[PDB]
Design a protein around this ligand. Structure first.
Ligand SMILES: Nc1ncnc2c1ncn2[C@@H]1O[C@H](COP(=O)(O)OP(=O)(O)OP(=O)(O)O)[C@@H](O)[C@H]1O
Ligand SMILES: [Mg+2]
Lengths: 466, 50, 518, 147, 48
């Protein structure tokens, strides 16, 4: 079970094993270094006579062409369990946080697992209750579904993630997993760790309810490739217990990019624009473990970065082939003190049909985003007509649009200790009733800024009465 | 008509089941027979079959 | 009569088996790649056999593979199952059969793999005949001109872009636009039209295929529907052979037929849910086999790939059985890039296109058909005489409105005739708007279009036109059940608006309009 | 050493082939007996190797010498993996019997033994890319006939 | 309920299964030599 390194070209290591003890296609190689630690590779191609080509997972700047390699038999084994909660891990499952190593008693599970069979899949889509009005109304999630935010920095995406974790941990058991795939180490780390450690709910920090796995841009392509699978295994452990899991794969696109590099260094023949031939299958093997079974559901809300602004590019197209909802965070909404920067438009969800959410939910969600279908196109007319002083009836529509745009904002519990305002959890039924009653005209008596940060229409009324 | 078809399918299933029983019991049998004698006879016959 | 069983047995036991040992030729796996094995010297292997990979230590099952490349001193076999178990040195046995799938009455309402293995967990497939995947198209002289219509149930398709039995209409659209929605609406509408729908689901998510099967079961359409499924997580070989398995299952219906509702149905409808994903799977297979790429890295024989698949969908003449096999390929373009490689290939192959645009889908026209560019080369031959007689004015007025489509927001400051044309076009476009899972029968569509082409919806405001339809048919469904049957009975009449049905429909429309207020 | 490969390999293969071919005819001979038996037209070392083993009586092992003869001027890695599967675990004399009957395929090439207890009787002989099965083939052929 | 005809039909141990075992195991699989005391009892206990 011990082989010898033959070739070393970058982060691709070729190793010759004995004839009858060749490692499998996804086993770990685990090259031992002189200074005590080890370099864990991952097999990718069995070939030749006992020779395996593997991805480094590390630097490989200190390795000769004769070093021994110890096949581990099983694929990359990652610690799963309640112990691996509130801790930060790398691709190999080694805790990179300040605290000590994971104890040997904790169960280790293979990184590569078979997605749930067809029989276990739910026969009817189900809405996922987040508690955010704009999210649960315009772009409802899916139990065991995928959602992508298209937003930069300073739009409160991190706060949205923190509130989603807090809400799922409060209303449900709601353990959460966060896989930063190919993230900036500044943004992904020490600005997610500190913000979630500072953010607190029921005297428990958000970080205490969240697992973190971080494969950053500095790590070799294999690490960024398999960090997503590490997070999937950690989440699937809890899913097997029946508990609902919310998983944030930050920059799933950087996953695809990683695979591309892994293919280019593996000698695979390029596909489309330099991308790997195994693009669809590689994305499926990661996006199919994110599904709602009978026992539990791994709901995922990913982040997608499109190169330039090309949605035609193979990586964004492959990502979109596996997406159930899109949330479009915008700078304009964020700079208007609207804490949830979710754009009422450009935020779609296939659940928004009367068969799943309900006829009333669909009707109001079409009533809203219709007064904004024009995006208040009147705003262009107001610019060169001044409303023609006033519009015959349009002026009402403008008032309703401004009121509902203000009402989309909601006080978040994670920000409760920052802005000094209690967090409001709004059920989907409360959201639909509030927006419907506002659109009937009950909301034509209150002025604006009374909808600025309040959970329900009833909460707005209490304020008007007081 | 479907009940008649299912009756025919049950007859076929019974035939397959008794085939499974005869094969499995013939595998259990002849094990002690080879253990008692003839273990090397089959080896020699196969080696000559090459 | 157990003696019959004892007599049938004990005879084939004694003299039905040769039991003669003989040298058989096997192969050794010498390199396992990303789902590709090389199999070393396995001779006497057919160019598309399904090799076995017999069980070994640590593996109690068998993963099958397709011997796609018969190189010299090597046979690159694409692995159908999971490649993580097959290692170098493994033995392979060449099963002598090209991939075949079970067919017949047994596979109705069952979800199966492209290999015919059930995945719905409702029991083994009951069958007695296996049809070979990758058979030659029926032939030139074997077919007949398409005449029988396939009632989609959507007014836009069924009125402007006819689909007939044997016609191959392409559902091409951009990402989330309603292609699977249109296919499912077509499948649900064949409840009593004596057709066996087939859904292939190439590369779709397991969740999406599960929801499609749930929708079909919920509407009772899983008693005449065969669902094949090669999902995204499954190997590229399964996605590559899924549409061929589906169309073999459909060719069994076309040639031999199945007993549906106690009637010999020989018509089948097959929906390839993504040929844009089947092409991607075949591209991955080819590139992992190191075959020379072409444009967009697709292999040279990728036009041949879809051409074999779609050219088996035919309308056989009376000599060969009179069966049919309608194909509804589905393509996901990127940013409406119709000039892309696979979309152009399938557009050239197919007999028509249903262009679904994201602009109309987001605007509010939920069936997002673009009638300007969507064509059906079969045309009026794939429509009932009633719909053919009624939809001509619909098409003309819609074209006139499209010519004036830039003018809708300036309708007030225009000519009276131009304003009338714009208003009529808006009413017709709102009429074509349709909810999901609500297919309209042929008589209902004919009645609504007769009410629209004739000046009967002119007084109804545009935003209520849809509601008007949703009421009018209900009226005809309850108040006047006889006029619907009268329309449906003489829908094949050459001069469909015969005086009897004309007076009946006129009276029904007038009675509905008098009572209702809009 | 590199220049040796062609000529030395050819000579060693010729000697191995000559010894293997003369193994049937020259069995249990002596120096003069094998000199009259083994063809003298072979290589100068080949005839000497054929005669010397018979002179000492080791002519039966002379064919086995041929087995080492190619490997003396080769990497000796191209030995057929003649896997032998049998449910009954085989003794050392059994394995010797199998190898000595198996030398008819090349020589005493690399042979690996397995159990597969679910077999009954017989033995599965996988030489290179040819498999001979004689253990459970009969029962399952019978169950195919019955079904 | 009528499927109990299968259960009543399969109760033919002496008629079919015993002879089928004897023929299949002796004549076809191995040679005609099948002589070891206790095969009848083994067949009887395995069938049940
Ligand atoms: N005719 C329709 N009526 C109402 N809603 C519709 C209709 N067509 C589509 N939709 C809505 O759009 C959503 C997406 O439609 P659908 O899944 O059919 O699209 P698609 O083109 O097959 O997409 P994908 O590329 O994701 O497979 C549906 O879930 C539904 O909410
Ligand atoms: Mg679709």
């Amino acid at each position: 079970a011990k082989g010898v390194i033959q070739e070393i070209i970058g982060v691709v290591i070729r190793a010759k094993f004995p004839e009858d003890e060749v490692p499998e296609i996804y086993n770990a190689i685990e090259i031992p270094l002189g200074n005590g630690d080890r370099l864990v590779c991952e097999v990718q191609q069995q070939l030749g006579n006992g020779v395996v080509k593997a991805v480094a997972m590390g630097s490989t700047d200190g390795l000769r062409r004769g070093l021994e390699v110890i096949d581990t038999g099983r694929p990359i084994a990652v610690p799963v369990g309640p112990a691996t909660l509130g801790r930060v891990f790398n691709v190999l499952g080694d805790p990179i946080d300040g605290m000590g190593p994971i104890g040997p008693e904790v169960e280790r599970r293979p990184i590569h697992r078979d997605p749930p069979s067809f029989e276990e899949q739910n026969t009817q889509a189900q809405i996922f209750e987040t508690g955010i009005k704009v999210i649960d109304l315009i772009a409802p999630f899916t139990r065991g579904g995928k959602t992508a935010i298209f937003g930069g920095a300073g739009v409160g995406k991190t706060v949205v993630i923190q509130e989603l974790i807090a809400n799922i941990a409060k209303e449900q058991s709601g353990f959460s997993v966060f896989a930063g795939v190919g993230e900036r180490s500044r943004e992904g780390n020490d600005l997610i760790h500190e913000m979630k450690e500072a953010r607190i709910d029921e005297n428990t920090t958000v970080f205490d309810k969240t697992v973190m796995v971080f494969g950053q841009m500095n790590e070799p392509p294999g690490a960024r490739l398999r960090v997503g699978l590490t997070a999937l295994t950690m989440a699937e452990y809890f899913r097997d217990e029946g508990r609902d899991i919310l998983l944030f794969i930050d920059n799933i696109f950087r996953f695809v990019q990683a695979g591309s590099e892994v293919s280019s260094l593996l000698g695979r023949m390029p596909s489309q624009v330099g991308y790997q031939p195994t693009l669809g299958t590689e994305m499926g093997e990661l996006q199919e473990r994110i599904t709602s079974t009978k026992r539990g559901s791994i709901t995922s809300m990913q982040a997608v970065y499109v190169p330039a602004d090309d949605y035609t590019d193979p990586a964004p197209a492959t990502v979109f082939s596996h997406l159930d909802a899109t949330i479009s965070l915008e700078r304009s909404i964020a700079e208007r003190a609207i804490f949830p920067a979710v754009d009422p438009l450009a935020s779609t969800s296939r659940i928004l049909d009367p068969n799943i959410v309900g006829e009333e939910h669909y009707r109001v969600a079409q009533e809203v985003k219709r007064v904004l279908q024009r995006y208040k196109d009147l705003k262009d007319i107001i610019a060169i007509l001044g409303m023609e002083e006033l519009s015959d009836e349009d002026k009402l529509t403008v008032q309703r649009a401004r009121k509902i745009e203000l009402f989309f904002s909601q006080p978040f519990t994670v920000a409760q200790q920052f802005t000094g305002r209690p967090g409001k959890y709004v059920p989907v039924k409360k959201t639909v009733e509030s927006f419907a009653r506002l659109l009937n005209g009950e909301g034509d008596h209150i002025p604006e800024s009374f909808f600025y940060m309040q959970g329900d229409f009833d909460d707005v009324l209490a304020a008007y009465e007081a | 008509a479907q009940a008649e078809q299912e009756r025919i399918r049950m007859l076929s299933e019974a035939k397959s089941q008794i085939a499974d029983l005869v094969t499995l019991t013939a595998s259990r049998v002849l094990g002690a027979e080879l253990q008692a004698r003839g273990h090397d006879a089959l080896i020699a016959e196969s080696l000559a079959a090459l | 009569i157990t003696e019959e069983l004892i007599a049938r047995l004990k005879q084939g036991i004694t003299s039905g088996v040769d039991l003669q040992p003989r040298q058989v030729n096997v192969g050794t796996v010498i390199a396992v790649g990303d789902g590709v094995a090389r199999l070393s010297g396995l001779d006497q292997v057919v160019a598309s056999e399904i090799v076995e990979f017999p069980p070994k230590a640590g593996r109690n099952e068998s993963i099958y593979g397709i011997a796609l490349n018969l190189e010299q001193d090597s046979v690159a076999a694409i692995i159908l199952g999971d490649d993580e178990t097959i290692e170098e040195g493994d033995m392979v046995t060449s099963t002598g059969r090209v991939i075949s799938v079970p067919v017949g009455q047994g596979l109705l309402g069952r979800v199966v793999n492209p290999l015919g293995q059930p995945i719905d967990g409702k029991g083994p497939i009951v069958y007695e005949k296996t049809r070979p995947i990758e058979r030659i198209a029926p032939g030139v002289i074997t077919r007949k001109s398409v005449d029988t219509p396939v009632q989609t149930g959507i007014i836009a398709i069924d009125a402007l872009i006819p689909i007939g039995r044997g016609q191959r209409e392409l559902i091409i659209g951009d990402r989330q636009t309603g292609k699977t929605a249109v296919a499912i609406d077509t499948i649900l509408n064949q409840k009593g039209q004596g057709m066996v729908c087939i859904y292939v689901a190439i590369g779709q998510r397991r969740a999406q295929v599960a929801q499609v099967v749930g929708t079909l079961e919920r509407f009772g359409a899983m008693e005449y529907t065969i669902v094949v499924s090669a999902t995204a997580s499954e190997s590229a070989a399964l996605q590559y052979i899924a549409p061929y398995a589906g169309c073999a299952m459909g060719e069994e219906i076309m040639e031999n037929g199945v007993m549906l509702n106690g009637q010999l149905v020989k018509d089948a409808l097959i929906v390839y849910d993504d040929l844009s994903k089947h092409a991607v799977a075949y591209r991955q297979v080819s590139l992992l086999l190191r075959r020379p790429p072409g444009r967009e890295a697709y292999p040279g024989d990728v036009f041949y790939l879809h051409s074999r698949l779609l050219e088996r969908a035919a309308r056989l003449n009376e000599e060969y059985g009179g069966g049919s096999l309608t194909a509804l390929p589905v393509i996901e373009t990127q940013a409406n890039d119709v000039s892309a490689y696979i979309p152009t290939n399938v557009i050239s192959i197919t007999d028509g296109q249903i262009y679904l645009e994201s602009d109309l889908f987001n605007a509010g026209q939920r069936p997002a058909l673009n009638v300007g560019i969507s064509v059906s080369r079969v045309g009026g031959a794939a429509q009932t005489r009633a719909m053919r007689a009624v939809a001509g004015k619909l098409k003309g007025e819609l074209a006139q409105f499209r010519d004036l489509a830039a003018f809708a927001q300036f309708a007030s400051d225009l000519d009276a005739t131009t304003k009338a044309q714009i208003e009529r076009g808006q009413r017709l476009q709102e009429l074509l708007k349709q909810p999901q899972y609500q297919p309209l029968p042929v008589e209902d569509q004919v009645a609504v279009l007769y009410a629209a082409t004739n000046n009967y919806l002119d007084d109804v405001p545009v935003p209520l036109i849809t509601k008007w339809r949703d009421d009018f048919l209900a009226f005809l469904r309850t108040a006047h059940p006889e006029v619907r049957k009268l329309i449906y009975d003489n829908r094949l009449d050459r001069k469909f608006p015969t005086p009897e049905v004309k007076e009946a429909l006129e009276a029904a429309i007038k009675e509905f309009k008098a009572t209702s207020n809009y | 050493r590199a220049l040796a490969a062609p000529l030395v390999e050819a000579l060693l293969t010729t000697a191995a082939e000559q010894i293997r071919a003369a193994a049937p005819r020259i069995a249990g001979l002596s120096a003069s007996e094998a000199a009259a038996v083994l063809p003298a037209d072979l290589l100068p070392q080949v005839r000497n190797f054929l005669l010397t083993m018979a002179k000492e009586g080791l002519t039966g092992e002379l064919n086995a010498v041929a087995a080492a003869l190619p490997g003396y001027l080769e990497t000796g890695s191209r030995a057929v993996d003649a896997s032998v599967t049998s449910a009954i675990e085989l003794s050392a004399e059994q394995k010797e019997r199998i190898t000595r009957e198996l030398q008819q395929r090349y020589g005493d090439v690399h042979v690996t033994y397995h159990v597969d207890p679910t077999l009954i009787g017989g033995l599965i002989i996988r030489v290179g890319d040819q498999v001979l099965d004689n253990s459970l083939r009969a029962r399952l052929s019978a169950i195919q006939r019955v079904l």
